[PDB]
Design a protein around this ligand. Structure first.
Ligand code: XZB
Length: 101
């Protein structure tokens, strides 16, 4: 396991602690979010991020950050602002980026 894999696994653990319901733990299904796949072109979730770390697909912290932001932007695109999902996404986006400096 490489230094980047170790750091990104660390960051991912810390970020998932901010989502205790696991709303971001797995790909959003169309069953839970009607029409999701037709609206969101590039889905992302923490579980996919973990698989990408294990597969050694991230070669920089920038790339990991970009996936994290994608995940949050998707939730802010799909959901109305008055929803737990939009608010959580916005919160964890800023906290996450700070956390990761
Ligand atoms: C990231 N994310 C996650 C969920 C989600 C995933 C698993 C389980 C659950 C739960 F058990 F809590 F229901 C929710 C959902 S569900 C959803 C959904 N149905 N959202 C609607 C909220 C009301 S609205 O008028 O904004 C239309 C979208 C969006 C997302 C999401 O982005």
């Amino acid at each position: 396991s490489t230094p980047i894999q170790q750091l990104l696994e660390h960051f991912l653990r810390q970020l998932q602690r901010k989502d205790p319901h696991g709303f971001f733990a797995f790909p959003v299904t169309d069953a839970i979010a009607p029409g999701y796949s037709m609206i969101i072109k590039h889905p992302m979730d923490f579980g996919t991020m973990k698989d990408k770390i294990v597969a050694n697909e991230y070669k920089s912290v920038t790339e990991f950050k970009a996936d994290f932001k994608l995940m949050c932007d998707n939730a802010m695109t799909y959901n109305r602002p008055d929803t737990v999902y939009y608010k959580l996404a916005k919160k964890i986006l800023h906290a996450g980026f700070k956390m990761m400096s």
